[PDB]
Subunit: 67 residues, 6 copies
């Protein structure tokens, strides 16, 4: 029902997206990893080693793709 | 009922608009593409290739047109 | 009932106001144009041609007048 | 009941206060004028002519006094 | 029940704390004075004379101590 | 049920994480200490002496790990 759950549910892993959130924190190019809906948590990670980011889907504004 | 639904429903695709959101993320001149209302989702895209931005209508503050 | 509806209902068109919103987006000197209350929408516009701005009244913080 | 209504109800007019809102917009030193509680609207103003500010009490974070 | 009420209830007066709010307004080193829970209002004050700041507890994010 | 409760309950103490909140206040490299889920409060602290931070979990956006 929530738009965030759908726009994150059908994204195949491995594609790089840029996500803007309710706080205005502009998160740069991050390769999508996973999204589990039963609890509503999306695993992403960007190169740093490796830096894994864990955010809450219900407070996600927008996702942008690149082609 | 929601103002965001109507201000995005009767706007023809192809027109360039500038949208300000609840997080203050000022998105520049972007050409409209589509707005599917049944699940409340709107598509925009700006030149980059092409950069498609996908946002949630319910958390959309304001749209501005140019003439 | 909502304070924003009242502070926008009795403003005569043509007067310039400065409006601050919930995102901190400071919108400069804009001449008021219209405010239709049944759906809660306010038409404003500033000189650019002309740049028309559409915002949601329910998510409007404050308006300031000049004398 | 609401704390904002209480902190605005018994401030005598003419005293200078500095208010801070939910958007982080810091209002500078202004002279308090009025607070009509039946609809919940505060009347403040700062010197410019005169610049009158109309901000909803329900979305006011904090007020600071000076001695 | 609210975490802010508890973290402000057991803080002894006179200790200097740094508080972050929902608007991101970072308030520097300020000595705690009082917090009355029945109406949910907390008083702080920093050196300026004296500058007393009055905020609403329900919209307080976090407090930090120093040792 | 809340995602923040999950991402905080099963982090072992001693690991350094970087948290981001609803206000965009970015918390730097801070070693996690504790999380009392009964009242929903996370205990963290960073080197200064020592500076302890007390931030409500329910208004926490995201946590990031490092490897």
């Amino acid at each position: 029902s929530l738009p965030a759950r759908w726009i994150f549910a059908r994204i195949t892993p491995g594609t790089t997206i840029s996500i803007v959130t309710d706080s205005g924190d502009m998160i740069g190019p991050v390769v999508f990893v996973a999204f589990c809906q039963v609890h509503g948590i999306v695993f992403v990670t960007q190169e740093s080693g490796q830096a894994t980011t864990l955010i809450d889907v219900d407070k996600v504004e927008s996702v942008t793709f690149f082609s």
